[PDB]
């Protein structure tokens, strides 16, 4: 951060303070943009998924997150075409850090505005995670994987703590593996909504797929 070195905002403690109807001086987060690459690209056209995940519960800064994203931004021509690229982070710095400032910076002793009423003005906006919660995600085609992991590698340095990279067996941003996510197309009971999927509704819906047929189109 700017007023601090992120050593006092390394570890999760105190209950969550946020950008609220109680706080208000709360600054704007360092990124409000969380995707990178073809967001038009389909659920189906990209079937490759890697995650970034912490191993320790730690408060990643918004600035840090931004930095991480702009590794994977630049590792894209090196990768090969932004077309074959998605990203989403999946950790938004909702929570805000307090700073009681030390009024003395070149001299002058308080004991009057010392540690009395010494409650932080909110400066710092930050995200909490645990021992496996995701902190970057990349959907892509099965071409780039040694590229994306290297981008992640860069990202790993831009983040506090021991991270980890796991390749999901899913098609990227989906709760189905591949063994499943051909049977949906193959049997033809899938239903598409752009970047997402839906699936037809039998054990999904029943009271509204009782005397219904429009639910098999």
């Amino acid at each position: 951060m700017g007023r601090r070195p992120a050593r006092c905002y390394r570890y999760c403690k105190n209950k969550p303070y946020i950008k609220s109807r109680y706080c208000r001086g709360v600054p704007d987060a360092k990124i409000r943009i969380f995707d990178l690459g073809r967001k038009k690209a389909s659920t189906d056209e990209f079937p490759l998924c890697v995650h970034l995940i912490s191993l320790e519960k730690e408060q990643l800064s918004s600035e840090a997150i931004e930095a991480g994203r702009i590794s994977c931004n630049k590792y894209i021509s090196k990768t090969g075409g932004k077309d074959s690229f998605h990203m989403r982070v999946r950790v938004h710095p909702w929570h805000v850090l307090r700073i009681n400032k030390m009024l003395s910076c070149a001299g002058a002793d308080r004991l009057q505005t010392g540690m009395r009423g010494a409650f932080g003005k909110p400066m710092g906006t930050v995200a909490r995670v645990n021992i496996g919660q995701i902190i970057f995600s990349i959907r892509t085609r099965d071409n780039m994987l040694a590229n994306v992991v290297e981008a992640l590698r860069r990202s790993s340095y831009k983040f506090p703590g021991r991270q980890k990279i796991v390749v999901s067996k899913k098609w990227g941003f989906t709760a189905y593996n591949r063994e499943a996510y051909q049977k949906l197309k193959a049997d033809g009971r899938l239903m598409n909504d752009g970047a997402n999927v839906k699936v037809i509704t039998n054990h999904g819906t029943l009271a509204q797929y009782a005397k219904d047929i429009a639910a098999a189109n």
């Binding site: 400032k101 009024l103 070149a106 001299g107 002058a108 002793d109 505005t113 003005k121």
Partner: protein, 250 residues
Amino acid sequence: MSIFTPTNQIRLTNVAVVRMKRAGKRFEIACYKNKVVGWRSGVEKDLDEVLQTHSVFVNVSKGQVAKKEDLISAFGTDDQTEICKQILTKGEVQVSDKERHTQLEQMFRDIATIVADKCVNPETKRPYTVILIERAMKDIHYSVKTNKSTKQQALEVIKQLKEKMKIERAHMRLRFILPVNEGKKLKEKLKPLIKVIESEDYGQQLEIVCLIDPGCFREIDELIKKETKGKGSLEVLNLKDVEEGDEKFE
């Protein structure tokens, strides 16, 4: 100790005071010498980044905090946000050395940039020589004060340039509109006073007499020709001082 007590005085002075004299009462803010300056000429950072203390005193040195009531009385506001901002914008700052230097430089530039109109050209032109004006400013030993305005300083410097010596300069083109037969008379009168060119003689029409008059004593000059003439008339001007004509020794 004994009798020998480490006092070392009240609390360290080490920041810009911003003294605002509102409701006859002094309110002040812990900032920095440069930061305040930056704020007040464009660089709007954060309100508590430019302020090392986001609160208001009455005496920054002695470590005294004002009464909310006083603030209310003076400013008609309680929240320190607004009050602080006000203080920042319209209270007496303490500049650094660097800032002071910058200010000085600015002043210097604007007593050669304002004097670029009445510039010091060599034997022939070579019409601008603004660098040479700047150079000349301290060769005479001049107090380039940042208290006074630029225009005033310009006026001062030209008088000295006379006793440099290289003569005072301030010439433009006054195109005097002169009706009836007294115009001719006026023309005759003012020919030894200043230069006369682009003339015409008319009894049934206006006379466009173009003169080369003093520019830094121009209004006064304008006033004393009409009176001489007798009748009321119009005498147009340029802007203040221009370098269209000769500025070598003139």
